[PDB]
Each structure stands twice: as C-alpha cells, then as structure tokens.
C-alpha cells in the first residue's frame, strides 16, 4: 500500500534546497547553568544530517 512516515521524525527536521535535511541540535531544553557561553552560542544553531544516517533512514521520508 502507501508507505507511511515517521511522524515523530517529521516533527524533528527540515528539508533543504537540494535534498538535504536540516536538524535541530540537542543537549538543550534544560539547565545550562552547568555550561558555557561559546557552547550556548554554537548550540543556538542547526546542522545537517550525515549521509550515513541518511542511508539508515532514506526510505522513511517520501513526503518532504
């Protein structure tokens, strides 16, 4: 039948211009008192999926 999609993962990443996937970072959303400034800056960022996991997951997303 139709494939389905990983809704929980749909809730977690953005598609890019070419084909890539723009991920929100982690190690956030709680205490940063135990942390540093360069860290809180460089985590206020967003990065890309790697091709490895992309191979892991390619069939998950027909619908972005």
């Amino acid at each position: 039948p139709k494939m389905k999609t990983h809704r929980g993962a749909a809730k977690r990443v953005k598609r890019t211009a070419s084909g890539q996937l723009k991920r929100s970072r982690a190690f956030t959303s709680h205490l940063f008192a135990n942390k540093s400034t360069k860290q809180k800056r460089q985590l206020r960022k967003a990065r890309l999926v790697s091709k490895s996991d992309m191979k892991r997951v390619k069939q998950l997303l027909a619908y972005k």
Binding site: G8, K11, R23, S24, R25, A26, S29, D53, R56
Partner: protein, 97 residues
C-alpha cells in the same frame, strides 16, 4: 533500529510548528512576460490561460529576477519592491487588486 543504541530521532528534539495557513501564492518572475506585448494589460485569468500559471495557490505574487522588454500594465494581488519598480521603469503600472 540499531540494536538498542539510541535512534537519532529520539537523540534529537522535536521543534517548530506550522503556521497552518502558510501563504505563498501562484508565483511568477519577470522575464516570462517577454512573450507579451507593450502596453497590453496582463491579467490573472489571462495568465491562467497563457500557462505561465497552472492554477491559483493563494492568489498571485511576483519576483524581479528576469528582464522585461515590455512597458505595460498588470492587475495583480502582490508585488515585490523591485516588481512595480521595474514595471514603471519601462513604464506601465500595477492595478494592484
């Protein structure tokens, strides 16, 4: 699944939302208008027929990348800054609906 090592998709946090009525229009850039004449009124249903647009999405909206070669007038919803600028640069205008 990877044998218990954590999936990426719970390693990482859900974020963002959807402005559910996300509005971008039937878009069109500039140079496509070169097919038309000078002074000719170029209208929504005209361009529907003309096939630079296949259908209305949420209206219409414009972008200034191309080059016009046609002073003439339009009846549109939306415009960029460069859009009406380069209309009236050659001349003609924008009966902005």
């Amino acid at each position: 699944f990877e044998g218990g090592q954590l999936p990426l998709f719970r390693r990482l946090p859900k974020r963002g939302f959807t402005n559910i009525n996300r509005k971008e229009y039937a878009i069109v850039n500039l140079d496509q208008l070169n097919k038309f004449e000078d002074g000719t009124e170029v209208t929504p249903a005209l361009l529907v027929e003309s096939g630079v647009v296949k259908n209305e999405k949420s209206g219409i909206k414009i972008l200034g990348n191309g080059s016009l070669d046609k002073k003439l007038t339009v009846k549109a919803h939306k415009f960029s800054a460069s859009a009406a600028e380069a209309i009236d640069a050659k001349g003609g205008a924008h009966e902005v609906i």
